[PDB]
Write a protein that binds this DNA or RNA. Structure first.
Ligand SMILES: [Mg+2]
Ligand SMILES: [Mg+2]
Lengths: 98, 95
DNA sequence: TGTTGTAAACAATACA
DNA sequence: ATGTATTGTTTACAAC
């Protein structure tokens, strides 16, 4: 299993919208990607740093506080509705080999 | 009065190097910092979590198992031998 | 030029 | 109160 032809943001977007209510925890994001693209092993922290970096930089990823009744670590991440259609449209557009 | 121009790793190097056996317990590290740099008050625990985090993170600081000089307050912390000299020279390099 | 990949510095927060 | 792991923000620079 090799490195998929997608950017980290595209992968985040793939994972986020593939979730029941379209929102995930950082953890959830790592799980989705590692499950559907084994290349990214949960033991390599490299790409994970990359995921976090993309969540913060890219302005279209919004953080959602955990309900007070379910106090876990880290919040929920979801696509900004404003650009959801844009991001989702190209989330699966494979890119030319890097 | 004002936040010193040093990282937490630097303050720690400062504090340990300053102790006699050249080693300190977290508590000792805290007290050294707020005594020399009043800005850090034992009231704001923000920087204190930082100190504990920096101790665990940095492969620069080694944890020494404590015997019984205190059956109620953690281990001792001293600087990595191979890098001690480098750190000492950098401990006060304002950044 | 504008975008994406990596690495890392540096904290905040959760929690064992 | 001690100590460690995760989660998040932000820079700097390389690769595309
Ligand atoms: Mg964001
Ligand atoms: Mg350590």
């Amino acid at each position: 299993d090799s490195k998929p032809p997608y950017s980290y943001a595209q992968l985040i977007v793939q994972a986020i919208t593939m979730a029941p209510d379209k929102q995930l925890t950082l953890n959830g994001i790592y799980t989705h990607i590692t499950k559907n693209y084994p290349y990214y092993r949960t033991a390599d922290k490299g790409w994970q740093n990359s995921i976090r970096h993309n969540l913060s930089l890219n302005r279209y990823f919004i953080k959602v506080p955990r309900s007070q009744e379910e106090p876990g670590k880290g919040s929920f991440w979801r696509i900004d509705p404003a650009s959801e259609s844009k991001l989702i449209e190209q989330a699966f557009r494979k890119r030319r080999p890097r």
